[PDB]
Amino acid sequence: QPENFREVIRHSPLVYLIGVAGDSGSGKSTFTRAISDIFGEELVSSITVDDYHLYDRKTRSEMGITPLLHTANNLKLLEENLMDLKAGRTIQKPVYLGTFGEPELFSPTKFIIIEGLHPYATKSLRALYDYTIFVDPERDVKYDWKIRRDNEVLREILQREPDYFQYVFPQREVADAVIQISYSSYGKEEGEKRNVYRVMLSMPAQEYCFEDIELNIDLCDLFKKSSHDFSLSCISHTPDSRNMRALVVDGELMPDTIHKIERQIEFQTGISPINIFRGQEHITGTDLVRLILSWQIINGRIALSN
Amino acid sequence: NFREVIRHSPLVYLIGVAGDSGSGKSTFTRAISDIFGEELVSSITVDDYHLYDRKTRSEMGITPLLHTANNLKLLEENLMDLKAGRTIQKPVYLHDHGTFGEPELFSPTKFIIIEGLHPYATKSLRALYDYTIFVDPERDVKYDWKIRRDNEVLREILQREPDYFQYVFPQREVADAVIQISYSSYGKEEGEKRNVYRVMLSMPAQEYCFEDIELNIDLCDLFKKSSHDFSLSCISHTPDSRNMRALVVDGELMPDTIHKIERQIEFQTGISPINIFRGQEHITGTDLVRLILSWQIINGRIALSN
């Protein structure tokens, strides 16, 4: 008999912890939102590791200390809070805003997303997570998104890079999913123009598949003129001394390629519609990786009931 | 429904397959017949129309790729007769040593495949076909299936290249489907070892889809350690200065990725099962492309009866 996500979590008080790590301006929140939208406000609540800064915006500047350092964050208090949450206990947690705010009384939900620079920077913190994601875009893409927001700021970037590699980058080595967005081999311009990027999803050996989850490509449609280009591939690679398989999507696909995937995810979460969260005319690599990631969480939650 | 369309229709569907010697035509022709069945499909090799045998051609220092070395005018006469539904008497060339054989009687079938060096080498001949295919493998690939396949070959290859470009290559521009094979972006040894090559199928403006034909890629399996590498992409290139779109397949796909496509072909042809005709453990770019073209033929036959 097929298994059901909602069946698995109703009978259990188990708190599923999800970590989302990455450098600032790394596009972390686009994935945090994705998980929330897809799973709903009742199942999901999140926390940002920023709430655990030891120093405030002001003092840090005077100390010339950057937030990328571990000793610049209350990682001991975070681990303390997370362990309590897992046990289902309510917690009183700090709150950042550019300064400290009134502490909060945060209470558990079936799914909690811990998003920040060091969600699982230590072995102790790592061992608490049931699912970890690391967002690692290419340098040129990431800094562009920075200018698009903020040369005028070229020092900040290069200045903090060594800290990022020393204190944030390691988490990449122990993440259940690693996402790297780069420029499409169809042009950098397609990046902000149509949000078409060459996205890659890297994951360790798949230990379990609770159900078929298929992408349906019509082999007659792609021959029609006006048909948009796309590339989908999967090849083995060995990042950070570890074996992984990388799914690489590029270009755009017709919405009909993911109708079943969306329907199957909706039925499972009982949250719909979710087609409102992606493009109406064409589906991109980021969109597809968002659904795969989301399905990987359901899968992983069901694998856990077993 | 395919089977019933060819029911009350004396019409003869003429399929042409051109390409240099040792390019896989013969094995592509065989795949089609396996899918449409021996009762519906019949075939002819244009080689039966050589005017000079192997011994003679050596003396002359001539190559069989010349139009003047072939009785193309007879082939055309035979084809027109065949299309009208009349039995013909045609020549036979025994490749055992390169000698002429005894003439044969060939009576029309509703599907006739004409595979050879010059199936439609003349504007006149092209006019008779309903669907034309050009197999165009890369040089090292094309020669491999020869120099190691069978130094007569060496010297004969040097001697043919010019004639190829002059008497065979022109057909590629007027073909409905162009198939290009080159060494896989993976093991260039896998071509001989697992029939894994990088295959590209180009066709002009795609309009009219008898029905949906979709490839079902499972997005969980591909992350399984035992999963094989593959890539699927669709671009728009312009060989011979014309607008075509190309499906590029490389690597291996699981068999169930094409289970529905197979069942849909089996349903229309009445011939089954057809999984005996392709990898039993893995699908190659070549297995898939054969399925697609046999499906384009059906689609072409249903279209023609509209």
Residue numbers in the entry:
A (entry chain B): 3 to 99, 103 to 155, 164 to 319
B (entry chain A): 6 to 155, 164 to 319
What does the article say, verbatim?
Archaeal PRK homologues show approximately 30% amino acid sequence identity with PRKs in photosynthetic organisms and form a clade clearly distinct from those of bacterial and plant-type PRKs in a phylogenetic tree.
MhPRK forms a dimer with dimensions of ∼105 × 50 × 40 Å3. Each protomer consists of an eight-stranded mixed β-sheet (β1–6 and β8–9) core surrounded by several α-helices (α1–α9) and β-strands (β1′, β2′ and β7). Two sulphate ions are positioned at the active site of the N- terminal domain at the edge of the dimer in MhPRK. One interacts with Arg59, Arg62, Tyr98 and His100 side chains, and the other interacts with the main-chain amides of residues 27–31 in the P-loop along with a water molecule that interacts with the side chains of Ser31 and Thr32. Mutagenesis and structural studies on RsPRK have also identified other residues responsible for Ru5P binding (His45 and Lys165) and ATP binding (Arg168).
